[PDB]
Design a protein around this nucleic acid. Structure first.
Ligand SMILES: Nc1ncnc2c1ncn2[C@@H]1O[C@H](COP(=O)(O)OP(=O)(O)O)[C@@H](O)[C@H]1O
Lengths: 89, 125
DNA sequence: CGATCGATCGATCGATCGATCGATCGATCGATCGATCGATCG
DNA sequence: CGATCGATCGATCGATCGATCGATCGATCGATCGATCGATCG
């Protein structure tokens, strides 16, 4: 949509890994069926004994679900933001 | 509310240098048919039409070319007879897709353009 | 003498798929129309 | 000089079969949770 002139960076897939790690920790994302904090010690024992597939599959293919739906983003995100126009489908 | 809008249909808008169309959706026992019967019997030269009772050339006038004078002639149609009036269509859902298709130009541009062998012209409806 | 741990099995949630069916959009073979002219007749 | 059937080929419509698609019944293994238990050492 920016016209070409007669004679914005796409960040590398490796650099985006840090951004993904940041967002996964700040709980904007969540693993597909993440139970999260278990209720009691016995449940924590059975959880730590088991090995979830989501922790074994590669960083690029872990399934996630979203906590802030796009509508909430359009409510919150300022319209002065460059990427705001994409808060709609 | 049904009374007002259908009355507002008879009043109409204001054409300038205007028609209002209404659809009735409801269970098949509530006063739908009776009002449409009244409208075409209270408006000048209204036409009563149904889904299977009409065709694509039912609302559209059959334009043909004369066999001796070779001029263009028209044999009238439901949407041509009721020019300036009100056309009542029952079972508007059950209208054939081909018949339903030609409504778009009629409802928005009030014209019927036909392009067939030897005939290229547009009408007003 | 018992307290800690790493492995195994049964059971269950669920995410998914194959077999089957009737319903929706469309290609297209068949019926009809039409336009000029020709052959028979008055 | 005019009126009545005939054959042909393009053009149009339409109806019929078919291609395409969303849905449910039957199944099942991927993922996980908990119980079982054999093994290890304070
Ligand atoms: N609100 C109403 N006022 C008067 N008559 C009504 C009303 N609702 C239903 N009816 C009666 O129910 C019948 C429905 O017939 P009609 O509306 O013509 O076709 P349909 O049965 O398809 O709706 C009419 O004969 C009408 O007298």
């Amino acid at each position: 949509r920016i016209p070409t002139v007669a004679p914005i960076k796409l960040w590398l897939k490796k650099d985006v890994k840090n951004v993904w790690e940041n967002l996964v920790q700040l709980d904007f994302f969540t693993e597909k069926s993440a139970v999260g904090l278990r209720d009691n010690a016995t449940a924590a024992f059975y959880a730590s004994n088991y090995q979830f597939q989501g922790t074994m599959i590669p960083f690029d293919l872990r399934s996630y679900q979203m906590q802030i739906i796009l509508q909430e983003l359009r409510r919150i995100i300022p319209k002065s933001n460059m990427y705001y126009s994409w808060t709609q489908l | 509310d049904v009374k007002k809008g259908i009355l507002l249909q008879l009043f109409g808008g204001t054409n300038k240098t205007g028609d209002i169309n209404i659809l009735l959706c409801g269970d098949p026992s509530t006063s739908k048919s009776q009002i449409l019967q009244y409208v075409h019997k209270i408006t000048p030269r209204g036409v009563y039409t149904s889904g299977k009772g009409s065709s694509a050339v039912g609302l559209t006038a059959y334009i043909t070319r004369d066999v001796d004078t070779k001029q263009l002639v028209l044999e009238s149609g439901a949407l041509v007879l009721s020019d300036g009036g009100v056309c009542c269509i029952d079972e508007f859902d059950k209208m054939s897709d081909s018949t339903r298709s030609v409504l778009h130009e009629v409802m928005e541009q009030q014209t019927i353009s036909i392009a067939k062998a030897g005939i290229i012209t547009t009408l007003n409806a």
